[PDB]
Design a protein around this ligand. Structure first.
Ligand SMILES: *[C@@H]1O[C@H](CO)[C@@H](O[C@@H]2O[C@H](CO)[C@@H](O)[C@H](O)[C@H]2NC(C)=O)[C@H](O)[C@H]1NC(C)=O
Ligand SMILES: *[C@@H]1O[C@H](CO)[C@@H](O[C@@H]2O[C@H](CO)[C@@H](O)[C@H](O)[C@H]2NC(C)=O)[C@H](O)[C@H]1NC(C)=O
Ligand SMILES: *[C@@H]1O[C@H](CO)[C@@H](O[C@@H]2O[C@H](CO)[C@@H](O)[C@H](O)[C@H]2NC(C)=O)[C@H](O)[C@H]1NC(C)=O
Ligand SMILES: *[C@@H]1O[C@H](CO)[C@@H](O[C@@H]2O[C@H](CO)[C@@H](O)[C@H](O)[C@H]2NC(C)=O)[C@H](O)[C@H]1NC(C)=O
Ligand SMILES: *[C@@H]1O[C@H](CO)[C@@H](O)[C@H](O)[C@H]1NC(C)=O
Ligand SMILES: *[C@@H]1O[C@H](CO)[C@@H](O)[C@H](O)[C@H]1NC(C)=O
Ligand SMILES: *[C@@H]1O[C@H](CO)[C@@H](O)[C@H](O)[C@H]1NC(C)=O
Ligand SMILES: *[C@@H]1O[C@H](CO)[C@@H](O)[C@H](O)[C@H]1NC(C)=O
Ligand SMILES: [Ca+2]
Ligand SMILES: [Ca+2]
Ligand SMILES: [Mg+2]
Ligand SMILES: [Mg+2]
Lengths: 483, 482
């Protein structure tokens, strides 16, 4: 049988040898990249953990699958009951399904796995960060195979921050299991220490000692994640199935630094993506330039198992259709895929800053539906040494070392248009430039067509109201906003 | 031998003889008022159907029970799994529970009823608006009583709008069951027609021909609701249990007109409230001046059945405690209750305009957490003839007959302070008046203390961030908000 393994880092970026970062040591991801197609232009559709995971596992944008924000405690979003997720369709077609690590989506009836070791039924630390334990669970999973195909989803909790939840293990949990007093030992992990001066400060991160100490800790933890990818792959090799298994490696959202996680800017939505098919070796070790979305993974995995997406409606007779496509053709030839979309509504339930985006190659358009209010900041990020330092400096009147200032981080234009080929840092908004008005109209039109097609309840916001029974279906509010 | 009946109108206001509206015919609500304490100053804590129903049935504000907006389809809010609602606690203590009508809350595990006829398992029209059907189901319920006390919740769908959902029955479904072609017959209902010139136009509603035709249809439907209250009470009398039954009549939110439903203004949150205890006749037919909240119903009903509220946490070890109180002492003496709170986060999921409020007697303070954006407008209200007419006129530059203009309806101050004893229409904002600063501080403070005490996730918004492990727990964002 064909099997499939999805490896997902949490808040992972491009800190790998495979993405040309020579400061970090990620031998196992580098070895995987040599047996993979590597995508330079992959994007998540949403820069929020639960919406991202839900969109990845359904192939529907968050506005359509119902996970409008975080899933846990107080935030409490869940996808619609009638949604047919990837693991549900795979089970119905006879594929054995497993998840180890952070799930962070619900309800269980929409995202059922036959074998499930997650934060719901055990320690996130043990099933998300202790790579020895993850190794042992992957082994248990493989040893209980029954000649059905399998789909195994390994959702690492590394390299997510711990400053909010678990401060004594350090800002990225880099001290958990490192064998120092009070930390325990993860016997399969060799900790890699980084000096703050050795890290690459990305362009959107302030270059200060506090941010550098933050990145050094992240690097150690990306290291633990990389070793975990090694262990997992080694278990599939020991069980003799690796050579029958599609391996995909990605991350759910951008790194938890300014302009990253929670933004539809490039740093918040750009994701590493490796795809390794044992049946398509032609392109192993090559780099694709095609513009692809995490919305493509569900149709890629259904394609691999030859399972159709069924025609159904979640509500009324609004039939659901996937807007992503299978990546499997890209394994044989380089395609001209150019367009990716973004949709975000909430992160935390108190953070209502809906954003819609479309990218056409190096051009990116963001629409900020709630732009008159300041951009909200999540609680986990707020206590980061990086945010603290930026805030402390901004208020004390000192230089921040940052490529923006807070005021403009908080108060954004309704429309932001950027050309990354000329302006890769996305600091020159072109939506106000009359030379770019025909492009701006072309992009707004594509984004709107996608919004309708995916049944976006925010399609008419903020200037209008959706009224499905009349033509035109967006009706004006005359609320002093552009229409 | 105590039982309890809760009668809840949907979007009902003060269109009754009991509230001295002389234009409408509500004989059955009037008769009930004669055997009740009537509250002049009762308020819902939230002006949205599912949040209101959830808060009423739990005694927790919406920000604490998890029903942050509407429950149905795309909006999809549910209360937290570990919440102990009124019907759950009543069942655990041995009280048989029933619901007939519009439930509009979830999940079923948090709001379980032994006998249940709702939108979940049948037509909302039949179990919410067809009073004959409702009469027959209350009869079935009573005929199947056993050893036990009962709690029966009858949640009428009248007088809610039908313009959005069910247009062919008229703007308030006033033609459904009226015996005309295509409409069917509700044999127990006598339809009452109103001329648009006979209705009372409330102060917050434009006095125009379109709005008057809108109110005339509402009146016919308030009439059907009143007749349904009559039938329900008559079934309890026929079964011989009315005299053992606490009857409460209220509504979930203000009327679906401008400044009403979805606002924390007086018109959106003020509710009719009748309480009739067969064991406390001293104040039957009287009017209380005490300021009370629909957050008080759950503790009132638990008090009636002598059931404690248990000590539990929904999350971690943040123990839940009710902030409302029992209304039963008010049946014996007039109390000095002065303070009522309001909390709204969403209505529709696309309508994020969180509002927090506190009222101290005739003073009201509203805090609009998202004030720099325009106030959103729900889809059902937008197609009302009343909103259409106001929008069309505003757009065409014609006089609106309205006490506000749209611009100021859309763009509100962060803090709105009003004194209804001098300014009942709430059009003179006093929050910027330095003479009123000490009162403004006193009220902000009370509202903040309630927010913490009820575990409000928005307690630090919009200028700060909640960080539970540091002191102070609200941490500043320096985002140009004061
Ligand atoms: C990570 O998980 C592994 C395996 O569960 C833990 O190692 C175990 O430690 C216990 C207690 O000392 C022993 O009884 C087991 O036999 C150990 N197993 C192995 C394979 O070593 C390890 O302690 C965990 N590390 C952390 C930091 O939690
Ligand atoms: C690993 O998997 C590949 C792909 O399934 C195997 O290579 C195929 O082997 C078959 C034998 O039935 C040939 O006819 C195919 O042409 C091969 N295809 C490709 C694309 O390589 C391979 O045998 C497997 N085993 C090892 C050790 O590599
Ligand atoms: C309102 O409810 C009553 C009771 O369900 C409906 O009357 C019943 O209608 C069915 C189907 O026509 C008959 O079989 C029953 O005999 C009727 N029962 C009674 C007591 O009359 C009535 O049709 C419903 N009205 C509307 C307008 O929907
Ligand atoms: C209706 O209810 C009231 C209150 O339960 C009953 O009045 C009580 O009568 C009983 C028995 O005589 C006594 O416990 C109390 O002294 C009375 N209290 C009050 C306030 O009246 C009355 O019995 C009931 N009527 C019927 C027909 O049963
Ligand atoms: C890394 O460097 C090489 C040579 O400069 C280039 O061809 C490759 O595409 C780069 N990698 C990525 C991930 O962009
Ligand atoms: C910033 O200032 C706060 C406020 O006193 C202080 O406690 C914190 O330790 C500082 N953090 C950084 C990164 O400067
Ligand atoms: C209505 O007016 C009557 C007679 O003037 C009075 O007794 C009663 O208090 C009033 N009802 C209300 C609800 O104010
Ligand atoms: C509002 O405007 C539209 C368009 O002119 C018109 O057809 C409709 O009847 C108007 N409605 C009201 C209530 O004025
Ligand atoms: Ca994440
Ligand atoms: Ca209502
Ligand atoms: Mg009973
Ligand atoms: Mg006007």
């Amino acid at each position: 049988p064909r099997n499939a393994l999805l490896l997902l880092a949490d808040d992972g970026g491009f800190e790998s040898g495979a993405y040309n970062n020579s400061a970090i040591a990620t031998p196992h991801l580098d070895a995987l990249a040599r047996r993979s197609l590597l995508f330079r232009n992959a994007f998540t559709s949403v820069s929020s953990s639960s919406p991202s995971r839900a969109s990845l596992l359904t192939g529907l944008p968050q506005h359509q699958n119902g996970m409008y924000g975080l899933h846990q405690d107080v935030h409490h979003f869940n996808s619609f009951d009638k949604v047919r997720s990837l693991p549900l369709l795979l089970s119905q077609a006879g594929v054995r399904t497993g998840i180890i690590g952070k799930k962070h989506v619900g309800p269980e009836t929409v995202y059922p796995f036959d074998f499930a070791y997650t934060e719901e039924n055990g320690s996130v630390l043990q099933v998300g960060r202790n790579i020895t334990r993850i190794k042992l669970l992957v082994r248990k999973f493989l040893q209980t195979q029954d000649d059905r195909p399998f789909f195994l989803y390994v959702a690492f909790h590394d390299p997510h921050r711990c400053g909010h939840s678990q401060p004594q293990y350090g800002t990225f949990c880099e001290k958990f299991g490192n064998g120092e007093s009070g930390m325990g030992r993860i016997p399969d992990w060799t900790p890699q220490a980084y000096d703050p001066l050795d890290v690459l400060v990305p362009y959107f991160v302030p270059n200060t000692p506090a941010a550098r100490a933050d990145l050094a800790a992240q690097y150690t933890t990306v290291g633990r994640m990389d070793q975990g990818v090694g262990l997992v792959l080694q278990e599939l090799r020991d069980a003799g199935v690796l050579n029958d298994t599609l391996v995909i490696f990605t991350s759910d959202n951008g790194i938890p630094f300014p302009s990253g996680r929670t933004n539809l800017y490039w740093p918040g939505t750009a994701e590493p993506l490796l795809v390794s098919s044992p049946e398509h070796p032609k392109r192993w070790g090559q780099v694709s330039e095609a513009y692809v979305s995490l919305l493509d993974l569900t149709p890629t995995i259904l394609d691999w198992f030859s399972i159709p997406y069924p025609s159904y409606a979640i509500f009324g007779s609004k039939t659901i259709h996937l807007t992503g496509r299978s990546l499997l053709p890209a394994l044989e030839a380089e395609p001209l895929w150019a367009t990716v979309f973004g949709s975000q509504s909430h992160h935390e339930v108190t953070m209502s800053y809906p954003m819609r985006s479309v990218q056409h190659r190096h051009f990116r358009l963001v629409h900020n539906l709630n732009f008159k209010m300041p951009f909200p900041i999540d609680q986990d990020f707020y206590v980061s040494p990086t945010f603290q330092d930026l805030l402390n400096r901004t208020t004390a009147g000192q230089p921040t070392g940052w490529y923006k200032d807070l005021r403009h981080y908080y108060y954004r234009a309704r429309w932001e248009l950027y050309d990354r080929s000329r302006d890769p840092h996305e600091t020159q908004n072109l939506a106000t430039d009359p030379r770019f008005a025909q492009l701006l109209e072309m992009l707004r039109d594509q984004l709107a067509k996608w919004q309708w097609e995916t049944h976006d309840p925010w399609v008419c916001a903020p200037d209008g109201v959706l009224e499905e029974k009349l033509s035109p279906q967006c009706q004006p509010l005359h609320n002093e906003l552009r229409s």
